[PDB]
Structures are given as structure tokens and as C-alpha cells.
Enzyme design. Structure first.
Site, short mmCIF file in Angstrom:
data_model
loop_
_atom_site.label_atom_id
_atom_site.label_comp_id
_atom_site.label_asym_id
_atom_site.label_seq_id
_atom_site.Cartn_x
_atom_site.Cartn_y
_atom_site.Cartn_z
N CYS A 98 -8.58 -7.28 0.25
CA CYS A 98 -7.18 -6.88 0.06
C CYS A 98 -6.49 -7.74 1.20
O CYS A 98 -6.53 -7.63 2.25
CB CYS A 98 -6.88 -5.35 0.21
SG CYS A 98 -5.31 -5.16 0.07
N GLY A 99 -5.50 -8.43 0.48
CA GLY A 99 -4.50 -9.71 1.22
C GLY A 99 -3.58 -8.93 1.89
O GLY A 99 -3.13 -9.11 3.03
N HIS A 100 -2.89 -7.70 1.29
CA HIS A 100 -1.54 -7.23 2.03
C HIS A 100 -2.31 -6.16 3.16
O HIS A 100 -1.59 -5.89 4.07
CB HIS A 100 -1.03 -6.02 0.87
CG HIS A 100 -1.46 -4.71 1.01
ND1 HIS A 100 -2.37 -4.53 -0.38
CD2 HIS A 100 -1.38 -3.85 1.53
CE1 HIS A 100 -2.79 -3.17 -0.48
NE2 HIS A 100 -2.21 -2.56 0.79
N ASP A 264 0.51 -2.51 -7.67
CA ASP A 264 0.66 -3.19 -6.15
C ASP A 264 2.27 -3.38 -6.18
O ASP A 264 2.86 -3.92 -6.97
CB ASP A 264 0.09 -4.45 -6.25
CG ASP A 264 0.08 -4.98 -4.41
OD1 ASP A 264 0.60 -4.22 -3.68
OD2 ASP A 264 -0.70 -6.00 -4.12
N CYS A 268 0.35 -9.11 -3.71
CA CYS A 268 -1.06 -8.99 -3.98
C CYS A 268 -1.77 -10.39 -3.50
O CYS A 268 -1.86 -11.34 -3.97
CB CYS A 268 -1.47 -8.80 -5.29
SG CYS A 268 -3.36 -8.51 -5.20
N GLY A 269 -2.51 -10.32 -2.27
CA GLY A 269 -2.85 -11.52 -1.64
C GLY A 269 -3.84 -11.98 -2.30
O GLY A 269 -4.07 -13.33 -2.62
N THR A 270 -5.06 -11.13 -2.76
CA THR A 270 -6.13 -11.76 -3.32
C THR A 270 -5.66 -12.35 -4.56
O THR A 270 -6.39 -13.23 -5.30
CB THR A 270 -7.29 -10.45 -3.56
OG1 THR A 270 -6.73 -9.36 -4.04
CG2 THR A 270 -7.75 -9.90 -2.44
O1 PYC Z 1 -3.32 -7.79 -1.40
C1 PYC Z 1 -4.30 -7.73 -2.35
O2 PYC Z 1 -5.06 -8.35 -2.32
C2 PYC Z 1 -4.32 -6.45 -2.96
C3 PYC Z 1 -5.33 -5.95 -3.95
C4 PYC Z 1 -4.91 -4.91 -4.61
C5 PYC Z 1 -3.89 -4.57 -3.98
N1 PYC Z 1 -3.54 -5.40 -3.22
#
Ligand code: PYC
Lengths: 362, 351
Positions: A98-100, A264, A268-270
């Protein structure tokens, strides 16, 4: 005195650093877990899931949390080079990346001295040991300060487009849809909103949540996925709905549906890494070029592809015969996180909701 | 910059009790301190109650020094939409917090502790009941509800299909409620049916307000029906009935809802179906129990409501006491970075 009542009260408690990355919660648990068996971050996550899942539930859900909460347990690092072990959690289960929350965790490692700041430094590296592999983060310091973070960036695990132009038949009113599947730390079904017959707006949130759940269900049922280096990753945990931007600085806008169909608030980073791999695979983003993704709230993450790689003799569905192996890219994402509280979570044994609840339908 | 609080819930319903970090707030009674917050400092409420620190069904309060003689603790209630209690559930939480954490002292070998709250709406009198062999472990709390009364009886409101015409009673317990059997709406009370109960409740509320025009006789500011209380057979055989209160902007109470319990009680009481001192038990949609009793009744000469008969000299009003349990679920220090673009919160809830 009744300091014995306080020992008692705090039994089975957790300390957290409550954060958010541009509106999206990251409840980072810093203590109160016992030893969790497992050789790697992946095994610790499964252990938690198979044996101690009532913990995720009480920390993530009402009344302590809510239907759109997100968070993580910290651990000692296992992997060489890592500063922190982390396993993420949400209202449904456990994302491998998870990126965030990784942005939040880098920020918090630095703002609370988990990791130390080399005297006279602008950037502090913080390397997270995740279930998806090592994630190399950098906290970018507020130039004339000791440990005050402007923003944080992460070099994601290798991302790649997996399968292109997959037809999924959803029930009415949505019908038949065309999607790409891509890995950006989680597997994503990436779909244009235009195809759901819905606009990205706050007004349509509940409908985008329905549609994400149906799409995720139908993809996992119809299409088997497997990460070619990580055997534990073999489903599609998230749905990325994208459409035209509202901020002109941004290439596109998106909402991600995941967990127990939560949305989200961050970009969303991913999911950002996953769109980038996709465009890049398609010759529509170049190495070094800045890609900006906007959330439903209007939050921005900035991304760029730092390099590429072809891995000989390893193919995924999208890999053509004319190719010498699969394409992966390394994506960087940048965003900002804030500390919103220092929380101690308590669990009265007589509390019928010590293990949380949701009124979310079905 | 930072606030301290006790996160609590009252049988599932959130109650964030802010115990320090407000600046000095003027006012010579609590109603003036509430006005000052409203007019000069609403941002504090928003950042404490809304995402990301909060969420759309968050409720709570700010603790203050008491001003009214007799009172133990000053308090202003708040939620994500405004500054009212609603259902009264923060009162139970605050009475409990006050004893649990030391704000109020316990006489030695004492079994019940009075906690009197000084609120914008007047004194709220509560009792913390102590767990048998302890000095401040609270087993539950009782609150003397505002005077309640059946207002109007056998009201026929016509709803669109599939609900149709529906017989309801209208009764005041802090808000006016339309009390309506689930059977009447044709939905069995459950979590999985909640959105159907919500639709129907809103349908009902708009339809009643448009056609019936209710008025509190001593409180002219209250001229609508803001809550719909949907009741039915209990799941727990310790309980008389089960309910869900639909209120606000498509919201459901996870608790049995204290004031709705008090309203339901004045209703049963007017119809001769509950006695003074009888424990009425109400179950929520998640299985929790509240317990009430009617302590006493009164007549008010020359003031009448629709259900008041020609030969009756004044409306009937009752005093009920509502008991319930609040739990401490956290001790939190909240932070507001001035450069945090969400220091005042956000909501993705729409209407
Ligand atoms: O930031 C992310 O990768 C992420 C995945 C689900 C919620 N945020």
C-alpha cells in the site's frame, strides 16, 4: 491505589500513530502485538489472518474505526537493508502493498525517530519490508529543520501489466466490460469509468463501490492470476476506476475499490504504479516522465517510471511470442502524509463490540 | 494544536469526549459557550468529528467547568452536523467517563454516584452504578430524560408502494419521533434490511412533516418530526421489543436510542401498557439492551396536545429514566498541523 485498575484497563491495548495521506487513513500500530510466527512479512500476514483476524476487525471497524479505515502493524525488519517490517490491513483483509500507508510510514519513521536522521541531511531513506518485497522510501525534509517532513516518496516493488483487454460480464445495469489487470504491489483490474456508465464524483460513490465489488468478484471467479515470483499473490484485490481529471495538472482521476468494498480517498500508490506500468507497456509514458493522478477528493500523487526490465523466459498472459520475456518497470510515487493523533486503543472484555462491526450490506 | 479525549461508545454508538485543549471560551451559562463555539470556532468540531480523524457517524462532546449550581460537569454536545445530543447517548458516556477517570469522586463504600451535567439545554441528572466489588469500575449509567409524552395517536400516513398506508404514533422524548411497527412497513428488522428501513423511514419522515405539522406546546423551535423509530419483536427474550431509529441525513442509531426509548415509554404509558417502576427493556439492531422506567407522571393545566381528551384538564407528561452502558475504547491525543489540508475535515456523504 487504583493504578491496578489501569494495568487491568490497558491489558490487550495497542498504541497507534494515526495518520492520513491526503485524506486516506493509515492507522499505524506501533505496539501491543505479541510475537507472530513467520519467516517473512508474507507469513506473518497469513498467520494474522488465519489465527488472529479479530484484531484487524476491532482496530479497523466501528466503533474504533469505520467502514473506510485503513492501517498497518509494524514489526522488526527481517529482510536485509530494511528499517521496518510492515503488514497492511483494511476493512476486508490484508493488501500485500500500500502506497499511501507506505508514504505515511516513511513520514512517521522520521517524524518520531523510529529511524534516525543523519546530521545535516535533506533526505532520509526508510526501507520498508512488505509482503510484496522491499520498498525503498525517502522522506524529503523541510530544508531548515531537524526532522520535519515535506513529503515522502517510495520506489515500489517491480510493477507490470499482466493481461490486456479482458472481457468481464457484470450483471445489469453494468453489463459487459473491458479491463486490464496489472500488478503494482497488488493486482488491479483497471477499468475506465466510461464503461461502468458512471462518472467519478462524490455523488456516485456508492455506485462505484457496488461496481468495484462486482468487478472484483467476477474477475477472481473468471480469471486466475498468479504473480510469477511471489506464489502467495494470486487474486485481484483492487479495482481502479479511472476517468478524465478535474485538476488540469493531472493526467487522470481515479477511485480504488478494495477491502469490504471501501474507497481510497488518496489516489492510491499501488494503483498509480499499476496505471504507469500499463501506459508504459503500451508506449504511452516514457521513463522519467511525470504522471499525476487525482483522487475523488482532489488529492494528488506524482509518479514516474525510473527504469524498466525484461526478464528472460518468464511470461505472463500479455507477453507476446515476439518478446524475450516479461516487462517490469520500477515506479516512484510521491505524496504527503500527516500525523493526526497518538492513539491508545482499549478493549474492555465486557464490550460486545471489542471485535468491531460494520452495518455494511452483504 | 492538540486535543485530548476519551473515545467511548454507548452500546455501539460513538461518543468522543474531549477532555482538554480547547481554548478559553466565554459564556455565563453553557448555552452562551455553545453559541460562541458555533459563531467563532465551528472548525474545531469539524476537525474532531469528520474524516480523517472522525467519520460520518461520529458524535461527541467538549467538557467544561460547570457553572450551574448543583452541577458536576459542563458539557456541549456535537456531531458531524451540529451541536445537539439526539438520542441522549453522550450523556451516558460522559456520566461514565466522569466516574471512570476521576472527574467525579466516589463516597467510600458507595454503590451509585450522582453526576449532574450542565448542558445548553438545562441540567441532565445521571447516576453511575458501580460494579459490585469496586471503587470506580462503572457497570452502567442512568439518566433522567426530559419530560416525554404521547403527542398524537393512530396517525395514518400514506406512503408510496410498497409501503402504502401506515399507522404511527407521534411522541416527544427530546425530539419528536414517529413510532411505527416494522410489520406496518413490511420489512423485518435486521442489519441486511437496514437500507430498506432507511428508505422507508425517510419516506415516512418527509410524508409526516408535509401533512401533520406537529408543535411542542412549551418549545416553539421544535416543529417537525426528525426521527422515525421502527420497532418489532425482540431477538433477546430479556427484551420487550427491538428497534432502529432512522434520523439525520440517512443515518441509523446502533444503540437502542435513549430518548426514543423514553418516547416509546410515554406512548405505552399513555395507553395503559406500562406501569410506573416497570422495567421496560429495548434491544437495538445489533443486539444491545437499554432499560428504562417511568418514575412519575404529571398533568399540565390548560396546555393540550392532540391526544389530550376534552374532559382532561391538561396534557399528560411522564418522567422516565434510561439506563445503558458506555465503554472506553481509546485514549487519544489528536493533532492539527496548520498546513494539513484536511485539518478541518471532510465528508464524502452526500444528500
Ligand atoms: O496506496 C495504495 O496503494 C492503496 C491501496 C489501497 C488503498 N491505498
Amino acid at each position: 491505589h487504583q493504578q491496578k485498575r489501569e494495568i487491568m484497563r490497558f491489558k490487550k491495548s495497542f498504541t497507534c500513530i494515526d495518520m492520513h495521506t491526503e485524506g486516506e487513513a493509515a492507522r499505524i500500530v506501533t505496539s501491543g502485538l505479541p510475537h507472530i510466527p513467520g519467516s517473512n512479512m508474507a507469513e506473518k500476514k497469513a498467520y494474522l489472518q488465519e489465527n488472529m483476524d479479530y484484531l484487524r476487525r476491532g482496530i479497523m471497524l466501528e466503533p474504533r474505526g469505520h467502514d473506510d479505515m485503513f492501517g498497518a502493524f509494524l514489526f522488526d525488519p527481517i529482510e536485509e537493508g530494511a528499517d521496518l517490517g510492515i503488514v497492511f490491513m483494511d476493512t476486508g483483509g490484508y493488501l500485500n502493498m500500500c502506497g499511501h500507508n507506505s508514504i505515511a510510514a516513511v513520514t512517521a519513521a522520521v517524524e518520531t525517530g523510529i529511524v534516525s536522521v543523519p546530521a545535516k541531511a535533506t533526505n532520509v531513506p526508510v526501507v520498508l519490508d512488505t509482503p510484496a518485497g522491499l520498498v525503498r522510501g525517502t522522506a524529503h525534509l523541510q530544508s531548515g529543520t531537524e526532522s520535519e517532513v515535506s513529503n515522502a516518496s517510495i520506489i515500489n516493488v517491480p510493477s507490470f501489466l499482466y493481461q490486456q483487454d479482458v472481457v468481464v460480464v457484470l450483471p445489469k445495469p453494468y453489463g459487459e466490460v473491458r479491463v486490464d489487470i496489472a500488478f503494482g504491489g497488488n493486482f488491479f483490474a483497471i477499468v475506465p469509468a466510461e464503461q461502468l456508465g458512471i462518472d467519478i464524483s462524490v455523488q456516485n460513490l456508492s455506485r462505484l463501490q457496488e461496481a468495484g465489488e462486482l468487478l472484483r468478484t467476477e474477475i477472481n471467479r473468471s480469471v486466475k492470476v498468479q504473480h510469477p515470483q511471489l506464489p502467495h499473490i494470486n487474486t485481484v484485490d483492487c479495482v481502479e476506476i479511472y476517468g478524465p481529471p478535474t485538476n488540469p495538472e493531472a493526467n487522470y482521476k481515479n477511485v480504488v475499490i478494495f477491502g469490504n468494498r471501501q474507497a481510497d480517498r488518496s489516489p492510491c500508490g499501488t494503483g498509480t504504479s499499476a496505471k504507469m506500468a500499463t501506459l508504459y507497456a503500451k508506449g504511452q509514458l516514457r521513463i522519467g516522465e511525470t504522471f499525476v493522478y487525482e483522487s475523488i477528493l482532489g488529492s494528488l500523487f506524482q509518479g514516474r517510471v525510473l527504469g524498466e526490465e525484461r526478464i528472460p523466459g518468464v511470461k505472463v498472459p500479455v507477453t507476446k511470442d515476439a518478446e524475450e520475456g516479461m516487462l517490469v518497470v520500477t515506479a516512484e510515487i510521491t505524496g504527503k502524509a500527516f500525523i493526526m493523533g497518538f492513539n491508545t486503543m482499549l478493549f474492555d472484555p465486557t464490550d460486545p463490540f471489542k471485535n468491531g462491526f460494520t452495518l455494511k450490506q452483504y
